[PDB]
Enzyme design. Structure first.
Site, mmCIF file in Angstrom:
data_model
loop_
_atom_site.group_PDB
_atom_site.id
_atom_site.type_symbol
_atom_site.label_atom_id
_atom_site.label_comp_id
_atom_site.label_asym_id
_atom_site.label_seq_id
_atom_site.Cartn_x
_atom_site.Cartn_y
_atom_site.Cartn_z
ATOM 1 N N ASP A 262 49.707 41.726 89.880
ATOM 2 C CA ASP A 262 50.702 41.240 88.929
ATOM 3 C C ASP A 262 52.053 41.021 89.605
ATOM 4 O O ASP A 262 52.113 40.559 90.748
ATOM 5 C CB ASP A 262 50.840 42.231 87.770
ATOM 6 C CG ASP A 262 51.206 41.560 86.466
ATOM 7 O OD1 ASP A 262 52.259 41.913 85.898
ATOM 8 O OD2 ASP A 262 50.442 40.687 86.003
ATOM 9 N N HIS B 155 56.389 43.434 84.280
ATOM 10 C CA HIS B 155 55.026 43.266 83.789
ATOM 11 C C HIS B 155 54.050 44.139 84.570
ATOM 12 O O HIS B 155 53.247 44.872 83.982
ATOM 13 C CB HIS B 155 54.612 41.797 83.877
ATOM 14 C CG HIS B 155 53.679 41.369 82.789
ATOM 15 N ND1 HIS B 155 53.081 40.128 82.766
ATOM 16 C CD2 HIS B 155 53.289 41.995 81.654
ATOM 17 C CE1 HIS B 155 52.324 40.027 81.687
ATOM 18 N NE2 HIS B 155 52.436 41.145 80.994
ATOM 19 N N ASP C 52 34.065 48.015 64.802
ATOM 20 C CA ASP C 52 35.296 48.610 64.298
ATOM 21 C C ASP C 52 36.362 47.562 64.011
ATOM 22 O O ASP C 52 37.282 47.820 63.227
ATOM 23 C CB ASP C 52 35.834 49.630 65.304
ATOM 24 C CG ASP C 52 35.057 50.930 65.292
ATOM 25 O OD1 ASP C 52 33.864 50.909 64.919
ATOM 26 O OD2 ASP C 52 35.637 51.973 65.664
#
Length: 279
Positions: free
Chosen positions: A39, A69, A260
């Site tokens: 990143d 980030h 879920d």
């Protein structure tokens, strides 16, 4: 072990219901595993990394994360307050600049670097990689994620935040990696989260509290933030020896919390990353 009032995403991957506030995990916490965070970099100096984070490669001026980030997702992987594998080693690979915008050639190069750099390291439990970056479809970005995967790294990539089928996005559309989607604290699919048949698992991606640059913290939302949750989960499940680098995507999927999630478009997996921890 347990973590009281943990960030909701940590608590979610240790229970079968939303709303809870405790993160349960086995004491190992991913020790002996490494996670390459590919990143904008890692502010390795952050007290939340406790000297377990270090930069190993950049493709710019500094190894320093001027964006936040990468430090955030490094934090969600294995920072002490906000990380899944709180004992793991983190390796910053800076392919994004301090704006979060890395060329395909640079992201390919950083992936080929990890596939090689892992041989320089001591990751007895297994090598993980978290690619919270993204981008349009490209065979070359896809091929690099697959090479990185077949080289013995568990690759977890983000589905992207474009509320679309992820098959139009790289490295998301690469079949052989773990394309992670994003969910929120109410077990919804995240509003931005991509989907499609290529998606392998969903993670907590909305309002993820984690580390930030400047020794601070910050809560932000994206499938980019759901990727480290599974990456840390893989590093955690590998240190437990329950899975390997090459099968960790499907172990998390076999052991997920199914059904879920709401607003999971038909033809997309309804699986939530769940460490299945008990004592």
């Amino acid at each position: 072990a347990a973590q009281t009032n943990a960030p909701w995403g940590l608590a979610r991957i240790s229970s079968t219901s939303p709303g809870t506030s405790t993160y349960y995990y086995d004491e190992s916490a991913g020790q002996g595993s490494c996670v390459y965070v590919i990143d904008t970099g890692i502010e390795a100096s952050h007290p939340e990394f406790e000297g377990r984070a270090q930069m190993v490669k950049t493709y710019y001026y500094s190894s320093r994360d001027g964006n936040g980030h990468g430090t955030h997702c490094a934090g969600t992987v294995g920072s002490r307050t906000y990380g899944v594998a709180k004992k793991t080693q983190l390796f910053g690979v800076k392919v994004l600049d301090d704006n979060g915008s890395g060329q395909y050639s640079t992201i390919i190069a950083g992936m080929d670097f990890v596939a090689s750099d892992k041989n320089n390291r001591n990751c007895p439990k297994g090598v993980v990689a978290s690619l919270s970056l993204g981008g349009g479809y490209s065979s070359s970005v896809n091929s690099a994620a697959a090479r990185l995967q077949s080289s013995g790294v568990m690759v977890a990539v983000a589905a992207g935040n474009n509320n679309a089928d992820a098959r139009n996005y790289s490295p998301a559309s690469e079949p052989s990696v773990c394309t992670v989607g994003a969910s929120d604290r109410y077990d919804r699919r995240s509003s931005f989260s991509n989907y499609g048949s290529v998606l392998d698992i969903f993670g907590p991606g909305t309002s993820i509290l984690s580390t930030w640059i400047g020794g601070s913290t910050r809560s932000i939302s994206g499938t980019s933030m759901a990727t480290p949750h599974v990456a840390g989960l893989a590093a955690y499940l590998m240190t437990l020896g329950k899975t390997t680098a090459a099968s960790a995507c499907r172990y998390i999927a076999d052991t997920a919390n199914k059904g879920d999630l709401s607003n999971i478009p038909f033809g997309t997996v309804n699986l939530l990353a769940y460490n299945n921890y008990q004592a």
